[PDB]
Each structure stands twice: as C-alpha cells, then as structure tokens.
C-alpha cells in the first residue's frame, strides 16, 4: 500500500568497496511491490531515453528512506544521471548474451600505463554487474608516483537483439586473481560516437566570460565548501544568485555546466508546470521542494524564467500568480537555516520585468552580469568549437578564425553555433548536389560556404541596422577633423573610463546635441559616430515613436529604451527630434507633452542611465522646450556647418571616382569653388544630375563636357537663404 | 470489397488485361497529392526536399560532427499561397510518421489536459524513430508576448514547446514544420536560430510561376474538357499580375460556372463537351471577380495608343528620358554613381494633359503600371 511514484538518486556513502555498482539501497516494501527478487536486476526509468540502465539490486538495513535511491558515482557518470532527477522502476529485461572484446581508452592521459598497469582487469571486474560501455573509477593507488588516471571504455564491438537497450549491457565471465578475451588495452579511443552517448558538459566548454564564470564559481563555492568559516563572522551567507543577460548568451548552458561539474545535490524547476488551478497545491509543492532541498545540507537550487514565474506586481496584478508566490518564496528562502549551504540560481531575460522585491540587497545582493561577447570572446568560442569537432573534419587557420570573428561582430555564441550548423548542412547539400555521393571527408569545411552562411542567416535581432559592414565607412566621407576629435573623445569616455567614473564620482553627463542647417551633414555625422563606435546602432526617428493610439508612443519609448539598456553600452539617436520638441509653439497635443515629460524623466530624472548615451538631432533648435535646453543634458552644441573647401573637394573626388578625372575636363577645384553656397545634399545631387545631363546625348556615355555642367548649375537652385543661416548663428550667440 | 476466386497454382474472371486508364472517378475516391500538382516553386520545393531529407534519411552523417541536427523548420507566406498543400503533399509522399494537429481543438479550459495531450503526442513522436510533427496557425496558439497579455494559454506553451524540442534525443530523426500567416505575429522565442534557424518563405507567384500553375491545372483536367493554347495561357498569366494559385483556381471555377450557365441559357442543355472551355468566359470572369488585392488603391487604369495623345514634344522628350534611363542604364548608373533619383514632380494647370503623360506611359512602357487617386 506504499504506492511509490518517483525516486531520487544519491551517491553511495562510506565509499570503500562494498557494491559500488549495484547498491540500489531500496526499502524492502518496494522490492516486494515489484514482485522481483532483491538479488536480481533493477531498472531506473529516468523518464525517456529507453535502455533504463538495468543494474543489479541489493537490500538496505531498514533506515534508508524509501524515496531516495543510490546509483553510485560510477553509474552517475556513465549515464549522466545528475542529482535530484526523477526515476521509475520496472521489471528487468533479458539477461545479457556475452561480452566480446571491451577496449580501454585511457581518458585525458598519454597512455603508456604498463608500468602502473598491475593487471587492471581484476580491478575493473572485481565487481558485480558492471556495464561494459561504462566504467569510471578513481585512480585509487597505482604503484609509486600517485597521480590520477581515468579510463574510457565506451567503445564496443558487439550487438544485442533488443533495440530498447541503449548501452547494450554485457555479462562478465573471465578469470582474475587479487586470460581475458584477446587483451583489452588498445589505442587511446575517445567516447564512441556510434551509440550517441550524452557527452557531459565540461567546465572549459564555455568561455569568453572567464572572469564572470570564475567570480560566479567562487561566490557559489565559498559558502558550500566553507560554511563554518563564514558562519564565524555571524553575518550568514545569502542564498540568492541572479543571472541575467541578452538572449542566446548561453546562461542555461553554464547552469547545466555548473550542475554537471558539481557533485552536490542540484534542483531545478520545469517551468510553469508547478503552477496549477488549485491555490494550495502550488504552495504545497513549493514547500515539499524546499523541504527536500534543506533536508540534505549540500543542495543547489536552479530557477529559470523567474520573470514569468514571479512577474512585477505593480506592472500587472492579474491574479492567481501574484505577489503571494513572491512572498512565499521569499519566506522560504529567508530562513531555511542559520548558516547552512544553499545557493539559488535564477536566470531571467529581462531584469526590469522581475519583481523589484526579488531584486533587493537583503535577498539577492549578489548579481552576475552577462553581456554580448566581443571580438576576443567570439574568437575563443569559434576556436573551442573547432577543437570540439576536431581538425579531422575541417581545416581553418587562426587568421581565418579571426577574420570570421571580425566579420560577425554582432553575433552571439548561439548565433555562432547556428552558423556552424548551417555551414555544415550547406556543405553537405553542395557535396550531394555536385560531387555525386562522394565521401564527406574529402570536401570537409571551406571558407565560401561559411561566408554564404553568415550572409544568408542575418543577425538574430531582425531589426534594420547599418551594422557598418555593408554601409558607408570613414574613408568614403570627407569632413572636418575638428568635430571628429571631439566625438572620438566624447564616446571613448564611457566605453574606456567606466571604472574612472565610478572611482572619481564625476560620471558622465550623457548629453550631446547636434544642430545643423537643412541640407548639411547631420545624419552623416550620426552615421560617422555609429561607424567609429563599432557598437549596435538603433535607427530611431521622431515621428516613428508617434502613433494614432493614445499611449502607444509611451509603450514604444519604453520598448526602445529597455532594448538599448539590454543592448550593451551603446548610443541612442533620434533623427528628427524637432517633431516632438516644441509644445508651446503650434499648440501641441497632450500626447506630445506626455512624451516630452517621459523623455525628460528618462534622460536625467530620478534615475541615471550609465550604459546608453543619448544623442539628439533637430532641424531647428530654437523652438525646443526650455526644460530640455538645460545644462547637464544635451549641453554640448556643435555648429557642424556646411563642408569647407577640402571636404567639398574630397566629396567631389569620391563622386568623381566612379567617373574618370582625366577626361572630365575639370580640376576638381573649380567646381567646388563655384558650388560654395549649396547645401551638402545639393552638392551630392549636383554630380548625379550633371551625369544625367552628360548621358542625355546617347544614353551610355564615357565623356562629360563643360556645357553639361553649366546646364546642371543653371537648372538647379540652392534653396538656402541667408536668413536661416543668420537665425542659426543667432542661436549660437544666444547660447 | 469482394471475395477472390482463382483456379490455378503457384482462369481468372473473364480476362483482366484491358487498357491502362487512371483511377476510376465514379467512386470519387480521394487521390494522394504529389509534386506534379505543385508548380512554379522549383527552387523552394527543392529546398524543402533537402531540409526534410537531410535529417530523416541520413542523420548519422550530420551527427558525427556533434553539433546536433536542426529540428525546427519555419514556413510562412501570404494567405492562399498554397503552403498547406505543400504540407499535405510532403505528408502523402513521406513514408514516415506524421503528427498533424487540429490546433484550437486540443486547447481547453483545463491547463493540465493540454499539457497531458502535449506529453502523449511528443512521447509518441520520440518513441518511434521515424516521425514528423506538423503545426499550423503558429501565431494564434502562440501569440507574441509583447503584443498582449492574453492569459490562460500564453507563453507557457511556448516555454514547454522549447523544452520539448531542445532535448528530444542526441541524434534522432525528428523535425517540426510551422506554418504561419505572418511571421511578425509569431512569438520571437520560437523565431530563434537555436529553434527555427531554417526559414522557408513562399512568396507571391510571378508571371512564370502563374503560367506554370495554369499549365499544370489544365494538364490535370486534360484536353478532353477544354481547348487552350500556349499563347492564351501566357496572356492569362500576364493579365493576372497579382493573382495567386488559389485565385487562379477560383478564376477557373467561376469561368466553369459561367460557361455552364451560358450553355444552359442559350444552347438549351447541349452536350457538356461540345461547349467545353473558351477564352471569353475566362475574360469575363477575371473582369467581374475584382483583382486579388482587396480594396486596392493602386488600380489598373486603361491604356490608349500614341496617335490618340496630343501634347508638347518637350514633355514627351522628358518622358522618354525618364523611362529610357532606368531600364537600360542600370550598369551605367552603377559604374558612374549616378544611381536613380526616382523623384519627378508634375505640376500644372488642371485638366490639360497632367495625367495624359502617365496614361501614355502606362500604354507604351508595358511594365506593370499602378495608379492611386489621391483622396482615395
Ligand atoms: N558561447 C557559446 N559557445 C558555444 N556554443 C554556444 C554558445 N552559446 C550558445 N551555444 C550553443 O547554443 C545552445 C543554446 O544555449 P542555451 O540553451 O544555454 O541558451 P540561453 O542563451 O541560455 O537561452 P534559452 O534559455 O532560451 O535556451 C547551447 O546548448 C550551445 O549548443
Ligand atoms: N501551385 C499550385 N497549383 C495549384 N493550385 C494551387 C497552387 N498553389 C495554391 N493553389 C490553390 O490554393 C489553394 C490552397 O490554399 P492553402 O490553404 O493550401 O494555402 P496557404 O498559403 O497554405 O494558406 P492558408 O493559411 O489559408 O492555409 C487551393 O485552392 C489550391 O488549388
Ligand atoms: N557626402 C555625402 N555623401 C552622401 N550623402 C550625404 C553626404 N552628406 C550628406 N548626405 C546625406 O544628406 C542627409 C543630410 O540630412 P540633413 O539635411 O542634415 O537633415 P536636416 O535637414 O534634418 O538637417 C543625410 O541623410 C545623408 O544621407
Ligand atoms: N485624345 C483624347 N480624347 C479624348 N479624351 C482624352 C484624350 N486624351 C486625354 N483624354 C482624357 O483627358 C483626361 C486627362 O486627365 P488630366 O486632365 O491630365 O488629369 P488632371 O485633371 O489631374 O489634370 C483623361 O482622363 C482622358 O480620359
């Protein structure tokens, strides 16, 4: 009448020798309920992955609790059965036929074990059960020179009739004291890929965040491994650890890595399955989970999508899941014990959406920040991946890897993995289409398929962006170095002196304004800023945030600002802020005033945004509200007037570069001198319209004449009056 | 069904060898749709064939590297394009198991029932090695989280689907096909390179694709029921600049009804094959059906020849200028950097040849012309 439902694994205590393979400490009631002899085989369902790891069984001494079961570290490493998993029991399968060859692999060693061998076979098969594809044991004591050695035994050369058995366990009948089947030591084989064994996630698999992962590992290791030392201080160790970052950074991967690499008990939630219609069922389930958590001293708590599980109460008090669950989790994690050893890992995509009650120094003082990988991190990730599938399947030199990393500057580790997968599948498809069923080893991996892969896949942001790769560069634009010397320092201040700002307390005003006459270089200056910065750029313009619906503009503003906050320290730019700046003039609606107040509060009100930098562009800065025209925010003002002689000459030469200068008949200076009162846009359009005049004669031409240029000059107008220039100058004088 | 009786070892019932006709149509049995019906999407259908053949047929080659095979395939396009027909065709031609679902029928007021059904279906798919999963109307079942807080059925199903398709197995052979009307309404969580890195887009058919579809349809109903020439099909395809395959099928159907009713009215119940299908009924049907774009504003205004046009020669010269430059000067613009200003302003007194130039241009150019009335 016990009715056992789910079982939980546990390492075998006391070490020694004992069983070490078929402990299976289970209460005799469950043994009688299964109608199977205790001196026989047992199964662990572990949900799915058929094969069920048929291992022999043994009885306990009546104190071992029913729920918990022991699978030993050897089987735990063989099947990657991590702590806290659910298990099921069923009748054993047919007896194994026989074992044929069995071959050792000598994991992470240079082999040459004959000196320390000492008839390993007896040490390997001095145990009952023992599944041939998996044996992992401690080095114990082997002759002199201590050291540690491990063996890979995954490869096999036999087959079993049932397809259910994934690891095709074999029986043991050989001889040993304190000769085999044609020896067992041969070659340093790795994990067998034929059976597709689940490869454990190594601690070195993740990279590019070495400082962050080291800090996280130390912060979670010092409470568990040094509980008495921390309790001596009397301040008690916290249990909450916060993980956040942009999507695709692999936070779940590092959670899995730290769970696998830690021998302590680990617990994780399976998403919204805990949430149920019954009010008390969820509370009872959470209480039971916490009880099982602190019943054993070494325990790890993993929480995923805490934003969905614990949404902000102020943002939406829909009901059912509400602040009550936040309060009950806070009470549960506040007082499980005085010192204890418990750490809770919470991963959320949007920290702002999380309940601010969770984000408090009293409960979640320690935070871990993960950002977008840079060039070095992406290069390291690519090198790790190439080492992961080995040089036998691809050829890529270090310079090629660096070039690929530089080309894909806006990507992430998940993006790189998807790029590798798509490159592999496109290479396979090309080989199938062209080479007519050739061996895949000859074609391997090249550069053209990968280049086409990054061309086709496109960055995962799915938003329009110049990206600086296919757009205008610095050499294509000729301007004045006076503004360049200013902007380089201005945008190198935050990216390079964040620690200096933190130490000194001066911080950054984060306010820059650019005003220019119509037809001048203002959006050009913004593009130059974005190009030189080399950071993701959001193309936002004034009327874009405006919408017919009331309140939609505020929603769009909040969306773009929380996207910029999560898009690393960058620059946010407004193409035409003159649409919303004037409120007193023109009798602006209440929506414009609300948007202006919201942006005023966002720039330098109540909160400070250290990450993003606000740059604004206006067609006319004289009608702007006095609230925004305040020192501290958007204080810097640059005249950035029309291009001077050298800049105009460079622009003309760049436009004439497509043409031929020798046969053009111009010296590239007389045209600039004559076209001095025109705007930059008009100057650019002059070359195109003169080319049209030249090609008027017989369509495609190779010669341009002075009469065409004269007609082009006569047929166009500058459209700029001295009155607006005088007004713009008066704006500078008045400020 | 009827029982079998044979007199022999290792004479039938009055011979069995007679003709090589197709399946009997009197019973009107369903016919397994094949790739012959689909036409005009050769590149897209080949890409879909590759994407469905690479993981299922030879998963070991892809799994030997260790990067795991892709599991998510995304399909999207304008309504009525025929993507769901491609889904049914690949289901019929595939010998592997499929998991086509109804959609909202599974969704109920009980949150646990839907989760249990999802369990059962995905364990059924995973347990048997050859299995395919077909999911349609992705935007509904999984609305965008940022769009609205619908509640009940919400991003929880997105999370459980992601956890399901993340780790079904090491190599396996399992793919999921998602068909959505608009990719924008799809939850961005699904639209991820880790989940849906492969995207299949089936755009609106062009003139060649529409012509291929019409030819395939005519070959399907055979020449017994109609007499159409290649130039007639080409003209019909050219006239239908924006129609889709569903629109072409509707045009054929309405032409059939118009022909039937005209024959009944005039010929007084004449033989059906005598009148078959002509071109005048098709023209009347495409005129009366209204173009594919519902409530369109870029209308197809009529054309008129040059000798019916009267005006100054300077405007005609600028006309020829601005049409001859872009069509046959793209290489010149690319090499010279002139590009295309694409901006022309027409200002003048009302009622004197302001729109006459545009009308003559629509006539002469032959390119698909579109015009908008301003106040409309
Ligand atoms: N930096 C990286 N280096 C190598 N592989 C990576 C990297 N980032 C992601 N990947 C690959 O992409 C997969 C996705 O990682 P993971 O599931 O941890 O994503 P995540 O960013 O935590 O997001 P989500 O929770 O939505 O899955 C990894 O299992 C791995 O195969
Ligand atoms: N290539 C084609 N050949 C013949 N008929 C076609 C073709 N493409 C589409 N059709 C027609 O279009 C219709 C199929 O519409 P279907 O529902 O499959 O489209 P869909 O683009 O998947 O959109 P929906 O979201 O409505 O399912 C049928 O009437 C079919 O005859
Ligand atoms: N040297 C150049 N080459 C190409 N395009 C240019 C050049 N200088 C300016 N432009 C274009 O002219 C535009 C300048 O806009 P601008 O007149 O400053 O806007 P506003 O009228 O609001 O001040 C930019 O969008 C840019 O694309
Ligand atoms: N040769 C012609 N004979 C009869 N009608 C004509 C002829 N040429 C043009 N039209 C008519 O004159 C109209 C010209 O429109 P138009 O006056 O340019 O528009 P708008 O009133 O905007 O200036 C056309 O709608 C056309 O029907």
Swiss-Prot record, chain A:
Hydrolase listed as a keyword: yes
Subcellular location as annotated = Cytoplasm
| EC code | 3.6.4.10
Judged by the first EC level, this protein's enzyme class is hydrolase
Q: What does the entry report regarding how activity is regulated? A: The hexamer is activated by RLP24 during pre-60S ribosomal particle maturation; RLP24 activates ATPase activity of both ATP-binding regions and increases cooperativity between AFG2 subunits. The second ATP-binding region is inhibited by diazaborine; the inhibition requires prior ATP binding specifically to the second ATP-binding region.
A GO BP entry is: protein hexamerization
Known InterPro entries for this protein? Answer: AAA+_ATPase (IPR003593), AAA_ATPase_domain (IPR050168), AAA_lid_3 (IPR041569), ATPase_AAA_core (IPR003959), ATPase_AAA_CS (IPR003960), P-loop_NTPase (IPR027417)
Q: What is its main location?
A: cytoplasm
Q: List the GO molecular function terms.
A: ATP binding; ATP hydrolysis activity
Q: Which Gene3D superfamilies match?
A: 1.10.8.60, P-loop containing nucleotide triphosphate hydrolases
Residue positions binding ATP 2: 516-523
Q: List residues binding ATP 1.
A: 245-252
Instruction: Tell me which UniProt keywords the record has, alphabetically.
Output: ATP-binding, Chaperone, Cytoplasm, Hydrolase, Nucleotide-binding, Repeat, Ribosome biogenesis
The entry's stated outcome for residue 305 to Q is: Reduces basal and RLP24-dependent ATPase activity. Increases interaction with RLP24. Slightly reduces RLP24 release. Does not affect composition of pre-60S ribosomal particles or growth
Additional detail: Present with 799 molecules/cell in log phase SD medium.
**Domain commentary:** The first ATP-binding region binds ATP with low affinity whereas the second ATP-binding region binds ATP with high affinity. ATP hydrolysis mediated by the second ATP binding region releases RLP24 from pre-60S ribosomal particles whereas the ATP hydrolysis mediated by the first ATP binding region is subsequently required for RLP24 dissociation from AFG2, probably by disassembling AFG2 into monomers.
- Family, similarity comment: Belongs to the AAA ATPase family. AFG2 subfamily.
Q: Can you name this protein? A: ATPase family gene 2 protein
Lineage summary: Eukaryota, Fungi, Dikarya, Ascomycota, Saccharomycotina
């Amino acid at each position: 009448f016990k009715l056992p439902a789910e079982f939980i694994t546990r390492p075998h205590p006391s070490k020694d020798h004992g069983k070490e393979t078929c402990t299976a400490y289970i209460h005799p009631n469950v043994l009688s309920s299964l109608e199977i002899n205790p001196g026989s085989f047992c199964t662990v369902g572990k949900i799915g992955e058929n094969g069920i790891l048929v291992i022999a069984r043994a009885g306990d001494e009546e104190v071992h609790p029913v729920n918990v079961i022991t699978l030993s570290t050897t089987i735990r490493s063989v099947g990657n059965l991590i702590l806290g998993d659910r298990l099921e029991l069923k009748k054993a399968q047919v007896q194994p036929p026989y074992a044929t060859k069995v071959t050792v692999g000598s994991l992470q060693g240079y082999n040459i074990l004959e000196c320390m061998e000492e008839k390993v076979i007896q040490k390997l098969l001095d145990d009952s059960g023992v599944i041939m594809p998996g044996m992992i044991f401690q080095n114990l004591k082997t002759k002199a020179g201590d050291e540690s050695i491990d063996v890979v035994i995954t490869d096999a050369s036999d087959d079993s009739l049932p397809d259910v058995s994934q690891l095709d366990l074999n029986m043991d009948d050989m001889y040993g004291g304190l000769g085999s089947t044609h020896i067992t030591f041969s070659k340093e084989t790795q994990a067998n890929r034929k059976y597709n064994l689940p490869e454990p996630l190594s601690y070195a698999a993740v990279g590019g965040l070495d400082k962050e992962i080291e800090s996280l590992k130390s912060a979670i290791e010092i409470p568990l491994h040094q509980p008495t030392l921390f309790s001596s201080f009397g301040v008690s160790p916290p249990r909450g650890i916060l993980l956040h970052g942009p999507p695709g950074t692999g936070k779940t991967m590092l959670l899995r890595v730290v769970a696998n690499t830690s021998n302590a008990h680990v617990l994780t939630i399976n998403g919204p399955s805990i949430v149920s219609k019954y009010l008390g069922e969820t509370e009872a389930a959470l209480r039971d989970i916490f009880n099982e958590a602190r019943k054993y001293q070494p325990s790890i708590i993993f929480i995923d999508e805490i934003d969905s599980i614990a949404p902000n109460r102020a943002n939406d008090d829909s009901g059912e899941v509400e602040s009550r669950v936040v309060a009950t989790l806070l009470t549960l994690m506040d007082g499980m014990g005085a010192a204890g050893k418990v750490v809770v890992i919470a991963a959320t995509n949007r920290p702002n959406s999380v309940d601010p009650a969770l984000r408090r120094p009293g409960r979640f003082d320690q935070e871990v920040e993960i950002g977008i990988p840079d060039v070095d991190a992406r290069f390291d990730i690519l090198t790790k991946q190439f080492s992961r599938m080995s040089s036998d399947r691809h050829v890529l030199d270090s310079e090629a890897i660096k070039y690929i990393a530089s080309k894909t500057h806006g990507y992430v580790g998940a993006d790189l993995t998807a790029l590798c997968r798509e490159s592999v599948m496109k290479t396979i498809q090309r080989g199938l289409g062209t080479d007519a069923n050739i061996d895949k080893f000859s074609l391997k991996v090249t550069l053209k398929d990968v280049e086409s892969a990054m061309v086709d896949i496109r960055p995962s942001a799915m938003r329009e962006i110049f990206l600086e790769m296919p757009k205008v560069y610095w050499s294509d634009i000729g301007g004045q170095e006076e503004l360049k010397t200013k902007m380089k320092e201005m945008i190198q201040l935050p990216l390079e002196a964040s620690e200096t700002f933190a130490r000194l307390g001066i911080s950054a005003p984060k306010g820059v304004l650019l005003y220019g006459p119509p037809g001048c270089s203002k959006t050009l200056t913004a593009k130059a800023l974005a190009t030189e910065s080399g950071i993701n750029f959001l193309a936002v313009k004034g009327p874009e945030i405006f919408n017919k619906y009331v309140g939609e503009s505020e929603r769009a503003i909040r969306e773009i600002f929380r996207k910029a906050r999560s898009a690393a320290p960058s620059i946010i730019f407004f193409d035409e802020i003159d649409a919303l700046s004037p409120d007193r003039d023109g009798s602006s609606t209440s929506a414009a005033n609300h948007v202006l107040t919201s942006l005023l509060n966002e720039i330098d009100g109540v909160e400070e945004l250290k990450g993003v930098v606000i740059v604004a562009a206006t067609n006319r800065p004289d009608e702007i509200d006095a609230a925004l025209l305040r020192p501290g925010r958007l204080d810097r003002h640059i005249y950035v007037g029309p291009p001077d002689v050298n800049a105009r000459l460079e622009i003309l030469k760049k436009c004439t570069k497509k043409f031929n200068t020798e046969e053009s008949g111009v010296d590239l200076h007389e045209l600039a001198d004559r076209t001095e009162g025109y705007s930059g846009a008009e100057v650019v359009l002059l070359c195109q319209e003169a080319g049209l005049a030249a090609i008027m004669e017989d369509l495609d031409v190779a010669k341009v004449e002075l009469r065409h240029f004269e007609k082009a000059f006569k047929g166009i107008a500058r459209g700029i009056t001295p009155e607006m220039l005088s007004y713009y100058e008066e704006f500078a004088l008045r400020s």
